[PDB]
Amino acid sequence: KVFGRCELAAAMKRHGLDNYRGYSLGNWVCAAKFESNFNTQATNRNTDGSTDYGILQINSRWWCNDGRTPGSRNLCNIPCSALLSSDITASVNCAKKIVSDGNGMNAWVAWRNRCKGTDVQAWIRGCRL
Template sequence: MGALGLVTLLACLSAGGWGKIFSRCELAQTLQDSGMDGYEGYSLANWVCLAFYESGFDTAAVGANADGSSDYGIFQINSGWWCQDDRTPSENLCHVHCQDLLNPDIKDDINCAKRVVQDPLGMEAWDDWKKRCEKQDLTEWIEGCDL
């Protein structure tokens, strides 16, 4: 993404102020209510850990990749495969526009994350999950939450 494109995107996001940073327990509750605990064999704590390391629980997070694709939303869904951003050729396997993953309503993010983990890589599709969450004691991610 060019510098002007990045500045424009950041200006739109901050001017609109329509992103949301979830608290750990608020996200855990939302994910549990959406059937994520145990989905495809991954505990709720795995999902919370993933969201923290991918986006800091920020629905408006956008990350740029060396291949020209971008990652969007609380789960950092990639524009090269999972969503369409009008800049990157995409398979758009979640059938969603990437911008729709940046608002406080994370239903579409959750549906897309469910689609991602149905593929053979599962959560290994996310490098941060592999590095920071896989094979770790994740109890702290949901500890103290009233679930």
């Protein structure tokens, strides 16, 4: 599923991401835009053999199991394929664990490089929220 911008904003808010760990809802929409372009089915391999999955590109080395990543930890205790569903519940629950770990949203390279320090609130403007 390719979410609309305001459509994904409403869903992330419904699942309690707005202001989660102090990160306003705009930070999460911006991150999804640049990690996956709002596409729940996005997958991208990394150099270390792991792969990033879903609308927030969660990694198979530590967080989910795709059965092909050596040293997998599956800390979110889910198959990575669950991160590609049209229902973002699984990606949201795992993202909550990631952002709580210690480095905050810096765990998302696209957020650090393209969202952090910008007008992230622009990513929810015009949305009926």
